[PDB]
Write a structure and sequence with these properties.
The structure is a homodimer.
Chain A: E1 13-17, H1 21-32, E2 36-40, E3 54-56, H2 63-72, E4 75-78, H3 85-94, H4 102-107, H5 110-120, E5 127-130, H6 135-142, E6 147-151, E7 156-157, H7 165-174, E8 177-181, E9 185-195, E10 201-203, E11 207-212, E12 215-221, H8 228-241, E13 246-255, E14 260-266, H9 276-279, H10 284-292, E15 307-313, H11 314-320, E16 332-334, E17 345-352, H12 356-367
Parallel strand pairs in A: 1-2, 1-4, 2-3
Antiparallel strand pairs in A: 5-8, 6-7, 6-8, 9-10, 9-11, 9-13, 11-12, 12-15, 13-14, 15-17, 16-17
Helix pairs in contact in A: 1-10, 5-8
Chain lengths: 368, 367
C-alpha cells in the first residue's frame, strides 16, 4: 500500500514476528545499527530471544500479543510465513508495517499466486487447478507426464505414469490441489532483492542453489549460469503485481533448454541469501533493516569475494562438528537451537574462496 | 599455555559491557556461544545481546565470582578490574588473556622498562619521582619532554616556563618523563594470538587522533611500516602474554623512526573497520582464540576503508544525514546518554579511493 513510509532513526524499536534464525540475524543487524528489538515467538528457546531488548512469548494466532507488539514498536516486520494473513491485515491497519499483508496473503494460495504471476506476464511453470477427481483428467491432457500435484492451501505427489495416478486421487480427496509440469531441471538459481522507500530497489548477486531432499544444501556465488538479466526482468514484472518492501527472494528453475522459470517467492530474507553476511559489502539483513526503517538503500551490492554456503542440519553437525575447531575458513554460524533433529536447520557455513568449483568439490567430499 | 577448546554451546563471560563487549557478544552469539556480561550500569550497550546480565561494580568480588561460576571462559573488554583482582580470577577460572598485560600496562615505568628489556623501540624516558629528577630529564631528554603519572594526569614541558607545573605534578604523584617527539604519523597493528603460539596479523592501520580521541582510521596505512611493526610485535609477545585480539599503537617521528606507543590487551577502537573490510573481524578472531579454536593463517583486506568515530558532537552534526548514506555503514552503540566527547558509534566507509574518501570525511566532520 505505502510507497513512502516513516523514516525511523536509530533509537526507534523494531518488532519481529517470529524468533527463528532469520529473525535472529535481523535483530543483530538492527542492534548493530542502534535499533531496539522486540521479538514475538511461542517458544521460550527461540534463537532470537537473547538478541532482543524484549521477548513476547505468544503464538502467532494470538491477537492481544500481536497488539502488544504493535504498542511497543515503531515498525513491525516478519521472519517467517507464520502469522495468518487476516491477523497481519488487522495489524497493518493499526501499526507501521511497510511490508503490508498483500504478499503473505497471496503467497499462501498456490492457485492465485500462479495466476497473478501469469497475469503479471512472468514465466511460470504451466499449471492447472485440481479441485475434483475429474480435473486430474484435464491435467494429464494439459500438463504431464510428468506433472506434480501440490495442495493449494498451506504435500506433493510426483506423478510419472499411470502407476502414480491412484496415489494422486488420494490427495485431491483430502484437500484442494494444483498441478504443474515436472521439469527436467538443468540448474536452480535465486535472486535476493531489497526494496525500500520511494521505489528504491537493490539486487544481490545471482545465487546458484543445490537442494538435497527438498532442503537447501549448497549455495554458490557468483551463480555459474548467467541468468542475472533474465532474473531481474522477471523480478521487475513481479513487483508490479506484488508489493514488497525489505528483503525478498525469488527462486528460479533453469530447464534442459536453458529456459528460465519463476518457481517460488519468499517475502523475507531467505536461506539462499546468508552467504552475503561474509561475501558482500551489505548483507540481506543489513538492507532489510535499512528498507524497513525507511533509509536509503545502496544502489548496488558488491560481491567482495566468491562463496560457497552449506546449510548445517542436525545430521551435518553429527558428521562434522568435531572438525569445526580446525576450519576457521568455514565461518560457522550456529543458531543456538536447544533441540537437534536430523533435518532441522541448526546453522550454516560460508566458505569464501577464489575457486568455487574446487571449493564445491571439497564440500561434496566433506558432506559425504 | 594451551587453553580449553570450547565447542559451540559453551558460555563466555565478558567483564564490561560497553561497545567492545557488545561487539564480542555479537560474534559470540553468531557462532553459537552463550554470553554472560558483567557491568555496573543497567544501560550498558552489551546488555541485550547477552543471555545473562550481572549488574555489578568491577571490584565486586562476589559478583566477579558468580560470573566465573557461570562461564566456561571469561574475557575482559577493557581496563576495568584491578590487576590483583584479575590475577586471583585468572588463578581460579579460565581467562586466556591473563593478568600480566593488564598488570604491566597499569604501571608506566615497568611497562617502559619491560619494553626496553624486550629490545623494542621505546621513546627514551626516565623516572621522575623527586624534584631533582626533573634536572636529569632536562639533561638526558631535553626540551621538549613530557611528564606522565606513573600510576593510573599529564603535563607538557616545552621550556623553563613549564617547570613549575611539572614540579607540581611531582608533588602529588610519581612520574615518568619522555621525549616529546614531532610525530609524522601514527599506526597500529591489531593481532590475534591463540593456542599453540598461533599468531595472525590484521592489515596495518593508519590512525588520526583529535583532542586525544581516535578520529579516523585508514586502511591500508599510507606508510610502509608493516614489516617493522610485526618485528616489534614479535618482540613484545616474547615478554608479554596475550591470547585473543590485542593491539599495539606506534609513533612514526619526522625522521621515520618507529616507536612502540601503547598496547591494548583486548580488541581496540582502531580495529573496528575490520568488521566490514576484512574476511574476519577483530571480534571474530578474538572469540576463536579465547575458545581455543584454530585461527585463520592470514587476514585479507577485502576492500580499503576509512573509519570515523562518532562522538556525541558528531551525532549532533551529522545524524540527520545518516539516512541518505547507506555507504557509511553506521554503527550506533545504543548509549542513552549523549555527551559531546563520548563515543556513541562509528562509521566504516569502504572505498576504492582512500585519499578521495579522506577529503570527503574531513569536510563532513568540519562542522
Amino acid at each position: 500500500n505505502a510507497m513512502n513510509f516513516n523514516k525511523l532513526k536509530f533509537g526507534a524499536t523494531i518488532g519481529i514476528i517470529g524468533g527463528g534464525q532469520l529473525g535472529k540475524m535481523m535483530a543483530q543487524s538492527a542492534q548493530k545499527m542502534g535499533y531496539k528489538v522486540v521479538v514475538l515467538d511461542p517458544s521460550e528457546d527461540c534463537p532470537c530471544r537473547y538478541v532482543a531488548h524484549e521477548f513476547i512469548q505468544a503464538k502467532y494466532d494470538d491477537e492481544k500479543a500481536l497488539n502488544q507488539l504493535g504498542q511497543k514498536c515503531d515498525v513491525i516486520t516478519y521472519e517467517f510465513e507464520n502469522i495468518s494473513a487476516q491477523q497481519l491485515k488487522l495489524l497493518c491497519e493499526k501499526y507501521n508495517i511497510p511490508q503490508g499483508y498483500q504478499a503473505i496473503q497471496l503467497l499462501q494460495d498456490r492457485l492465485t499466486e500462479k495466476e497473478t504471476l501469469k497475469s503479471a506476464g512472468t514465466k511460470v511453470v504451466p499449471f492447472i487447478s485440481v479441485k475434483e477427481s475429474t480435473d486430474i483428467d484435464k491435467a494429464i491432457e494439459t500438463l504431464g507426464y510428468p506433472f506434480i500435484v501440490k495442495t493449494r492451501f498451506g504435500g506433493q505427489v510426483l506423478i510419472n505414469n499411470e502407476k502414480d495416478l491412484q496415489e494422486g486421487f488420494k490427495l485431491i480427496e483430502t484437500s484442494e490441489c494444483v498441478a504443474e509440469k515436472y521439469l527436467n531441471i538443468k540448474k536452480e538459481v535465486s535472486l535476493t532483492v531489497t526494496r525500500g522507500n520511494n521505489n528504491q530497489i537493490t539486487f544481490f548477486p545471482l545465487q546458484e542453489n543445490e537442494h538435497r531432499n527438498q532442503i537447501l544444501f549448497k549455495t554458490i556465488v557468483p551463480a555459474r549460469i548467467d541468468k542475472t538479466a533474465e532474473a531481474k526482468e522477471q523480478v521487475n514484472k513481479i513487483i508490479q503485481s506484488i508489493h514488497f518492501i525489505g528483503t525478498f527472494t525469488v527462486e528460479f528453475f533453469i530447464d534442459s533448454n536453458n529456459q528460465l522459470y519463476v518457481n517460488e517467492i519468499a517475502p523475507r530474507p531467505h536461506n539462499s541469501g546468508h552467504y552475503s553476511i561474509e561475501a558482500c559489502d551489505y548483507s540481506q539483513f543489513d538492507t532489510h533493516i535499512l528498507a524497513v526503517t525507511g533509509q536509503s538503500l545502496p544502489n548496488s551490492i558488491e560481491l567482495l569475494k566468491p562463496a560457497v554456503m552449506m546449510n548445517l542440519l542436525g545430521k551435518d553437525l553429527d558428521l562434522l562438528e568435531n572438525e569445526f575447531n580446525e576450519h576457521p575458513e568455514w565461518h560457522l554460524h550456529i543458531y543456538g537451537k536447544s533441540e537437534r533433529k536430523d533435518s532441522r536447520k541448526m546453522g550454516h557455513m560460508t566458505v569464501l574462496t577464489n575457486d568455487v568449483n574446487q571449493t564445491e568439490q571439497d564440500m561434496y567430499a566433506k558432506f559425504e
